[PDB]
């Protein structure tokens, strides 16, 4: 499904820079603790393609970004 990756630390969606393939966002799409095999930016919101549904992400069960 559609995952857009959140700041894990505590703040709200996480965001990028350089549009297109990302670095450390690339790699932290594609981890095998994730299962995806796609994931960019979109203007500035890393977007993951792949979470199952057992990854949560945005929203989030607690901050209400």
Do not use: I, M, R
């Amino acid at each position: 499904k559609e995952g857009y990756l959140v700041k894990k630390s505590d703040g709200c969606k996480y965001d990028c820079f350089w549009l297109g393939k990302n670095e450390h966002c690339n790699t932290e799409c594609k981890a095998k603790n994730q299962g995806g095999s796609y994931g960019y930016c979109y203007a500035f919101a890393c977007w993951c393609e792949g979470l199952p549904e057992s990854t949560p992400t945005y929203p989030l069960p607690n901050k209400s970004c």
